[PDB]
């Protein structure tokens, strides 16, 4: 063991409910894949990082299938919430 461990970056709704922004990631060469059917936003780690903190964005909803966030063509307001910045 020693493989993986990296947690998934999350967007949140106004009150703090988290949703992942990617359905897979690479952790030091180990791929980690979210369970099929998991709710996600199809914006990616990059997308979350580009969001201005504490501002509302219309985030595209999806559902994980084999490591990919498959968009539902629906949207929900989501936020990037830093500890500090």
Swiss-Prot record:
Effect of residue 32 to A: No effect on binding to CCL3
Superkingdom classification of source: Eukaryota
Key words, A-Z: Disulfide bond, Glycoprotein, Secreted, Signal
A GO term from the CC aspect: extracellular region
Glycan-linked positions: 13, 28, 36
Result of changing residue 8 to A: Significantly reduced binding to CCL3
Location of this chain's protein in the cell: Secreted
Phenotype for residue 84 to A: No effect on binding to CCL3
MF annotations from Gene Ontology: C-C chemokine binding; chemokine binding
Cysteines joined through disulfide linkages: 6-27, 23-64, 40-69, 59-78
GO biological process: negative regulation of chemokine activity
Primary location: secreted
Domain characteristics, as noted in the entry: Both the N- and C-termini are required for chemokine-binding.
Record-stated family: Belongs to the evasin C8 family.
General function of this protein: Salivary chemokine-binding protein which shows chemokine neutralizing activity and binds to host chemokines CCL3, CCL4 and CCL18. Binds to CCL3 with 1:1 stoichiometry.
Subunit-structure text: Monomer.
Protein name: Evasin-1
Native source organism of the sequence: Rhipicephalus sanguineus (Brown dog tick)
Parent-protein start and end of this portion: 27 to 111 of 114
């Amino acid at each position: 063991g020693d493989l993986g461990g990296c947690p998934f970056l999350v967007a949140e709704n106004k009150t703090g409910y988290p949703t992942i922004v990617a359905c897979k990631q690479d952790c030091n060469g180990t791929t980690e894949t979210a369970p099929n059917g998991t709710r996600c936003f199809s914006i990616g780690d990059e997308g979350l990082r580009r969001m201005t903190a504490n501002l509302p964005y219309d985030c595209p909803l999806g559902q994980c299938s084999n490591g990919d966030c498959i968009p539902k063509e629906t949207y929900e307001v989501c936020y990037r919430r830093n500890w500090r910045d």
